[PDB]
Write a protein that binds this DNA or RNA. Structure first.
Length: 809
RNA sequence: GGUCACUCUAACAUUUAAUCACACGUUGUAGCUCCCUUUUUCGAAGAAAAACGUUGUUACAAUAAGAGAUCUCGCAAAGCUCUGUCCCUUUUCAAGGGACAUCUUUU
DNA sequence: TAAAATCATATGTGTGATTAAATGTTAGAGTGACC
DNA sequence: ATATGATTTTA
């Protein structure tokens, strides 16, 4: 049986074939495949949303500028609007603003929009942003703070010294309703004084700007995610059909445990309770204890009888909304309407946009009723039952049948279904395990059954369950153990578990659940398994340690090489997110504002104004020395320089020899990822050209290679007098022999400054190099440096020296 | 009589995927402003200036680098229909099987 | 000294919304394969 | 985990 030892980073395996199953003789080969503060896709999604919001504000302000130009407010050129936007917004309530003052006010009320609530219509502990909009909305009605700007310049700037939010404080923020109110009042008051551009057309368009935001879920969105039995769409939970399915499932499975006997409801009892929770908001247990003439003990539960069996919350929510607003007559007609009642929960759960909800109910509910439901009702669940299959399977379970009986009356390894596995870790592990399985099938045929025993334990168990079921139920051209079972009898440990997982049976697992007795399924364990996986020896040293029973080795037995996933993607993070100042980049330095709460004395020693402002440097050095070089404890209260100004962050210089120009070419950021490295030789010397992601994106092929003691401009240039060996990606199989020694392994890192490389041992033997990684390896005078190749399992070790310099982009 | 797997229901815990917004923060540029290097003019202390650094605060612009049709992609993943490069079976070619991607898809 | 191995230091963040999907456990109902 | 500058030891 394939002894797959699953995992989120590695898949160890150990092949075994047994006669009569039961007692096994000996395995064939072993292997480990090692592939690779949360999922990297979360970073991509957050960056994507940030890009979308940034460009949407770009567009919104541009559109506002065009609108203002059309009214002859914003003259074509001369777009240097006043800076004192908040003060001018305050002044507009009492004086007339000019053309450009008003233009700045409008273009600024479009930028800082506010906060528009997007909660459900399910009306009736505040955080920071919400507790700031309310605490200012409760101050805007003091009649002394007529508008958010007036409150800002009369309360915020007066006491706190700033208007905008700062340093993670979510006070000083306002709701979009308050700013729209300011828009309206400003327009009206400017009409009172005579602003020519107070056109209410402009106000309507500007409210459209300051209020429009895309709905989060628009149309098929939910449908696009609901897709994963059968095939019809899974019904909503708040649908009368699904609600009655839950009710009948409970009632039929509501066995009565009385007098030590389990008795189902006879048809009389259920007919009594069939449609009972419809005339009451909740069917309590004591309510059942009366209608059915209970002999004073249910089935489960926990005389505190006041529990809930089944409340059709959907049914009672639609009424208490429609029963109000004097819409009694429609509900009475709608009290049955089983299709109609079903179709309102199918819409309010599948579509949330008011337009999209009104579309699904194609006038089938009166628009006066539809308005009330749109304004007061929301449904957001979904059940695991096709509604089409509900109309046929629910009637049978009315009282006479059960789910199992009702359904019966209605009666190599393929690729992992990606759409059904929307989690990159699980999908990656499953696909690499599938590749390993297909490889071992090719190398051995179908060995036997399969044996699998494995902060993200959720992902691991998703992988295990899905792999077991997929393997067992899929074929083309069976055992789920656990760690406790494995423990009974470097990175190579997954092989040992593999063997132990392969030498396992369902009988021992059941005996474990019922729990010396465990035997040895081989002639000898210690020497056999010690050299089989660990201490790799191709017979020989095995044979010297295997004097007795010289029946060892197989037609293909060889030492184990841990194959590692090749990463050859050319996309990634172009540059680091800390943007700096490149105005002094020619000096070789960057200038970044450093918060005082992180200004360690090391950082203070690189301040730009060290000697320009000597008194500042002296006092800052003293206070850091007074708190043991802990800026957080040192500058925990605002620092003050000579002259009464407050110091909150100081420009600090940093050593910048290599970087990326960003922000319109104004700033510089550190290199983030090195996608590929191109090797070259000239005069018996190995020179490596590093390539970064931003170079690939811009369509740039680097020329010069790494020179240790020189800067990027003075780096050795690869030209007609250089020989191109190959490219190098992270975790690439390379062979290195030098005058010092010989090492063969994986390549994961290039040191730009020193020029050294980081080569990693296949097994990550923690007694080898810098705990498994042979870091800082010099190859300038290397005898030979060749890129190898490896298969999924750790064999077919091929090498050449072919070349074609592949152009990025 | 047990163990385990699967199907449905409810409750709890956790995790993942997609979408809509907000508020900071960084950089650049102006206005005001805290300091403080240098150099002018009036001068026998001090004032008015100019360049550079730079503290705070307001406004405006960029917020990946970049690719496309006001508007869409761009840090993730899978794969072999199209494209490109390595590897094997039967100097080049042709078939078979596979590996990775700068190719396609999610989009 | 050139090249090489060692060490050492730094990485953008919090708030507020609509949803779907998966795993594990417990409670209830059941079928099916193996001890 | 990755990029890489500062510093020590080695050929």
């Amino acid at each position: 049986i394939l002894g797959l030892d699953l995992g989120i980073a590695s898949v160890g395996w150990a092949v075994v074939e047994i006669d009569e199953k039961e007692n096994p003789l000996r395995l064939i080969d072993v292997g480990v495949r090692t592939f690779e503060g949360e999922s990297l896709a979360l970073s991509r999604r957050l960056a994507r949303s940030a890009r979308r919001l940034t460009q949407r504000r770009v567009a919104r302000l541009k559109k506002a500028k065009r609108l203002l130009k059309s009214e002859n407010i914003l003259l074509s050129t001369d777009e240097r609007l006043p800076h004192q936007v908040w003060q001018l917004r305050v002044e507009g309530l009492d004086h007339k603003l000019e053309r450009q003052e008003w233009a700045a006010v409008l273009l600024h009320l479009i930028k800082h929009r506010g906060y528009l609530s997007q909660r459900k219509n399910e009306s009736k502990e505040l955080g920071a942003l919400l507790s700031g909009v309310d605490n200012n909305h409760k101050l805007l009605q003091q009649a002394t703070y007529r508008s958010p700007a007036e409150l800002a310049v009369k309360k915020f700037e007066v006491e706190e010294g700033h208007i905008r939010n700062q340093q993670g404080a979510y006070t000083h923020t306002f709701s979009r309703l308050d700013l729209l109110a300011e828009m309206e009042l400003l327009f009206s008051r400017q009409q009172h004084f005579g602003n020519p551009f107070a056109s209410e057309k402009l106000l309507e368009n500007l409210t459209a700007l300051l209020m429009w935001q895309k709905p989060a879920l628009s149309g098929e969105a939910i449908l696009k995610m609901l897709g994963k039995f059968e095939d019809e769409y899974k019904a909503a939970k708040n649908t009368y059909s699904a609600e009655r399915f839950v009710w009948i499932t409970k009632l039929n499975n509501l066995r009565i445990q009385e007098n030590g006997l389990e008795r189902a409801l006879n048809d009389n009892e259920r007919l009594a309770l069939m449609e009972q929770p419809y005339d009451k908001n909740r069917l309590f247990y004591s309510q059942v204890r009366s209608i059915l003439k209970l002999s004073d003990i249910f089935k489960g539960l926990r005389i505190e009888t006041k529990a809930v069996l089944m409340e059709m919350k959907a049914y009672h929510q639609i009424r208490k909304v429609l029963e109000g607003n004097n819409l009694k007559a429609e509900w009475a007609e709608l009290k049955a309407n089983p299709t109609l009642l079903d179709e309102i929960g199918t819409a309010f759960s599948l579509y949330k946009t008011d337009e999209d909800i009104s579309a699904y109910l194609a006038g089938k509910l009166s628009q006066p009723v539809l308005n009330a439901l749109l304004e007061n009702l929301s449904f957001d669940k979904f059940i695991q039952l096709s509604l089409k299959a509900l109309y046929k399977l629910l009637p049978l379970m009315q009282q006479g049948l059960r789910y199992d009986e009702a359904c019966r009356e209605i009666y190599f390894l393929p690729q992992i279904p990606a759409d059904e596995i929307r989690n990159p870790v699980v999908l990656r592990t499953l696909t690499q395990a599938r590749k390993v399985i297909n490889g071992v099938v090719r190398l051995y045929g179908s060995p036997a059954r399969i044996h699998i025993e494995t902060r993200n334990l959720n992902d691991t168990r998703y992988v295990a369950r899905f792999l077991c079921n997929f393997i067992a139920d899929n074929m083309h051209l069976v055992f789920a153990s656990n760690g406790q079972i494995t423990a009974l009898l470097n990175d190579r440990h997954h092989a040992l578990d593999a063997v132990v997982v392969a030498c396992s049976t369902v009988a021992m697992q059941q005996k474990i659940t019922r729990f010396l007795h465990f035997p040895t399924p081989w002639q000898f364990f210690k020497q056999e398994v010690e050299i089989r996986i660990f201490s790799d020896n191709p017979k020989l040293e095995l044979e010297n340690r295997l004097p007795d029973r010289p029946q060892a080795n197989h037609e293909f037995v060889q030492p184990l090489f841990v194959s590692r996933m090749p990463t050859r993607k050319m996309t990634g993070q172009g540059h680091m997110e800390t943007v700096k100042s490149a105005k002094r980049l020619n000096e070789g330095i960057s200038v970044i504002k450093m918060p005082l709460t992180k200004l360690k004395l090391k950082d203070l020693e690189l301040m730009v104004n060290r000697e320009r402002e000597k008194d500042l440097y002296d006092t800052l050095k003293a206070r850091l020395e007074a708190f043991n070089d802990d800026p957080a404890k040192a500058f925990a209260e605002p620092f003050i320089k000579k002259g009464g100004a407050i110091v909150k962050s100081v420009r600090v210089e940093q050593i910048q020899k290599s970087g990326v120009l960003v922000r319109e070419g104004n700033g510089v950021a550190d290199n983030a990822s090195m996608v590929r490295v191109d090797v070259f030789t000239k005069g018996g010397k190995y020179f490596l050209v590093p390539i970064y992601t931003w170079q690939v994106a811009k369509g740039i092929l680097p020329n010069k290679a790494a020179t240790q003691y020189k800067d990027e401009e003075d780096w050795e240039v690869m030209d007609n007098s250089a020989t191109f060996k190959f490219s190098l990606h992270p975790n690439d199989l390379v062979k290195l022999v030098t005058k010092k020694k010989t090492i063969l392994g994986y390549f994961n890192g290039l040191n730009r400054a020193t020029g050294n490389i980081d080569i990693k041992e296949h097994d990550l033997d923690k007694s080898k190099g810098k705990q498994g990684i042979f870091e800082g390896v010099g190859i300038k005078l290397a005898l030979s440096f060749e890129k190898y190749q490896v298969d999924e399992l750790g064999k077919n070790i091929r090498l050449c020296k072919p070349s074609k310099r592949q152009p990025v982009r």
